[PDB]
Amino acid sequence: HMCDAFVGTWKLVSSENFDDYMKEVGVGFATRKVAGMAKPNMIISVNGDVITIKSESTFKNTEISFILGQEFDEVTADDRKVKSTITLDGGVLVHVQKWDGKSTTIKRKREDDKLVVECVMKGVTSTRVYERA
């Protein structure tokens, strides 16, 4: 029942500062423009200890399955090859991605009826708000 309140199908409804976050990550112009249009469906499910987060989008579909605290390989939507570790900290899913000596942290939280995604690269934060689909 660890991630019960995250499970479901969610649709992106708002984004703030995503272009700057993507710049800080190293995403190039064309990918930033096309990625920034997308309104993905995020599908979260749990089976035993395995959490799956899928993103269905007009830009790029992605899928990760993981066990909390156990590092895994991830190919991000912008085609970075990262090493990811996801933990639960006070009810927040905390996702750290490492690649090329860089790091970004993505936090996912339930707030009211929304799922709020905060993406941080150095001093730059983007906030992406999802509602139930």
Ligand X SMILES: Cc1ccc(C(=O)CC(C)(C)CC(=O)O)cc1Br
Output the 3-class SS for the chain: CCCHHHCEEEEEEEEECHHHHHHHHCCCHHHHHHHHHCCCEEEEEEECCEEEEEEECCCCCEEEEECCCCCEEEECCCCCEEEEEEEEECCEEEEEEEECCEEEEEEEEEECCEEEEEEEECCEEEEEEEEEC
Q: Based on CB atoms, which residue is closest to ligand X, 32 or 68?
A: 32
Q: At its nearest, how many Å lie between ligand X and the CB of residue 12?
A: 6
Total chain residues near ligand X (CB under 6 A): 14
25 or 86: CB nearest ligand X: 25
Contact status, residue 93 vs residue 100, Cβ threshold 8 Å: no
The binder of ligand X chosen from 25, 51, 82, 93 (CB under 6 A): 25
Whole-number minimum distance, CB 9 to ligand X, in Å?
14
Q: Which of 35, 44, 51, 86 binds ligand X (CB under 6 A)?
A: 35
| 77 belongs to the binding site for ligand X (CB under 6 A) | yes
**Does the protein bind ligand X through residue 20 (CB under 6 A)?**
no
Q: Is 116 annotated as a binding residue?
A: no
Write out the binding residues for ligand X, residues 37-56 only, by CB under 6 A.
40, 55
